């Protein structure tokens, strides 16, 4: 059965009739058509579908769309300002924290949640935040560098750096 779903998605108010059994991943990819969020496994194992719900990471494949009613949802498509990359996106690109690019949207969203909560994460804290995000291309080394570069670029001058 379909029921009304109201939420804020990528900065815009949404008011849609959505199936009660629809996963947030399918709602995003198929109803709104935002293909940045990927499916890399059969359920909760890889993090490729990570999006933000009220600033915190959430697996879109293991979340019913209806559970995010009235919350603020953000996908990789919302990070840039028109065509200008955010500092986090520019760092992944420039430090090569992304190769094939498939795990990247999920990896960047988990990185974004971390940087909003902990502006200056230690190397162990980065690893701990990205623990559920699998990447097969990088060996992770440059992903960690990308997050450290993004953190410094966003970091406040009047504090310790």
């Amino acid at each position: 059965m379909k029921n009304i779903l109201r939420l804020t998605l990528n900065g815009r108010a949404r008011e849609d009739l959505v199936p009660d059994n629809m996963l947030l991943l399918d709602y995003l990819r198929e109803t709104v058509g935002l293909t940045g969020t990927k499916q890399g496994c059969d359920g909760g194992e890889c993090g490729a579908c990570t999006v933000l719900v009220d600033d915190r990471p959430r697996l879109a494949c293991s979340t019913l769309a209806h559970q995010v009613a009235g919350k603020k949802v953000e996908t990789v498509e919302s990070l840039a300002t028109q065509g200008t990359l955010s500092k986090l996106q520019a760092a992944f690109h420039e430090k090569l924290g992304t190769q094939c690019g498939f795990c990247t949207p999920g990896m960047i969203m988990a990185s974004e949640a971390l940087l909003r909560k902990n502006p200056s994460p230690s190397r162990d804290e980065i690893k701990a935040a990205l623990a559920g995000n699998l990447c097969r291309c990088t060996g992770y080394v440059k992903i960690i560098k990308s997050v450290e570069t993004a953190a410094a670029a966003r970091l406040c001058e009047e504090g310790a750096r």
Binding site: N21, D42, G44, G47, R56, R58, S62, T63, Q67, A131
Partner: protein, 323 residues
């Protein structure tokens, strides 16, 4: 689009509303869905409805009671628990166990109630509809034979929950709400050692909260073993609580997980009064071994899972003793 049965999704604002919704047939409680959705997607269940508990106001509140007891609503997230300052300083084993669960993203929404009530696991069960129907299903769901223990007197799927053992050695209590009303039982009693009916909750019942009493002279910790350093369920998990008098064991509590169809307390009175030495550790190992019933419901072997279960039981008591 990923296939799920065409279920209704109820979003009650109160426990009463949730309880009433759970009265209908084939209706299941829903936390963050980190355990249930992967299961439903694989065809392990065909619900007519899910009752979302994440919208119930106040169900996620964490607080410290009058008598110094900790009260945790069933909706509190594992992340909130692992980061709660009071829990980390006073009931560290709980924060340790919560933090050891799955990955950080799962923990950001995964609830306490959902963690305790998570389903048992087995390699013949956590498989696709195609894989399972091809194999004739099994006793736990849509079949009549257990493929691990052919006798099939029951399902032997293993309970791999990390938080349960920690709450057990901390002597926590589970507050249950149902059509009959509210009732409380020691947390250890929330479980039954039966793979396909592993919880003592009745039709219409929900775990509403967990209460942990002041620790007094007890210190506790939790230790988990897994091949990767994150995400993996415990291949073996041991929580222990200790009370040390001079150089003698005045109090000891030990709970295991990742080993039986239920997380279990290990009877350890035989060590009370004794010292903590190689001889005592060995008696623990054998006591733990007796209670445990490590079976091949996991892709990893039984020999190893039993060996580390015994090994970490010593390790965690040792860590407490030498603290």
């Amino acid at each position: 689009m990923n296939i799920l049965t065409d279920f209704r999704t109820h979003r009650p604002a109160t426990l009463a509303d949730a309880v009433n919704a759970l009265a209908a047939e084939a209706t299941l409680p829903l936390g963050a869905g980190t355990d249930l959705l992967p299961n439903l997607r694989r065809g392990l269940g065909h619900p007519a409805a899910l009752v979302d508990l994440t919208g119930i106001d106040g169900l996620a509140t964490i607080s410290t009671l009058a008598d110094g007891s900790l009260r945790i609503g069933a909706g509190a997230t594992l992340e909130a628990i692992a980061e709660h300052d009071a829990i980390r300083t006073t009931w560290p084993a709980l924060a340790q166990a919560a933090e050891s669960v799955a990955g950080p993203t799962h923990r950001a929404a995964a609830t306490l109630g959902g963690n305790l009530c998570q389903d048992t696991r087995c390699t013949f069960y956590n498989q696709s509809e195609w894989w399972r129907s091809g194999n004739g299903y099994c006793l736990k769901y849509k079949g009549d034979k257990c493929h691990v223990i052919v006798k099939s007197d029951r399902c032997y799927a293993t309970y791999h929950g990390d938080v349960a053992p920690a709450l057990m050695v901390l002597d926590a209590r589970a507050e249950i709400v149902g059509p009959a009303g509210k009732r409380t039982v020691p947390v250890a009693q929330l479980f039954r050692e039966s793979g396909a009916e592993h919880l003592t909750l009745e039709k219409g019942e929900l775990l509403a909260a967990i209460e942990v009493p002041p620790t007094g002279a007890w210190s506790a910790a939790y230790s988990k073993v897994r091949i990767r350093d994150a995400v993996d369920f415990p291949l073996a998990g041991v929580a222990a609580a200790l009370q040390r008098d001079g150089d003698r064991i005045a109090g000891l509590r030990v709970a295991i997980t990742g080993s039986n169809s239920a997380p279990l307390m290990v009877p350890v009175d035989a060590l009370l009064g004794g010292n903590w030495d190689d001889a005592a550790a060995e008696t623990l190992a054998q006591l733990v071994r007796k209670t445990s019933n490590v079976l091949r419901t996991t892709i990893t072997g039984v020999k190893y899972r039993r060996r580390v279960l015994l090994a970490i039981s010593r390790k965690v008591v040792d860590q407490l003793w030498e603290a």
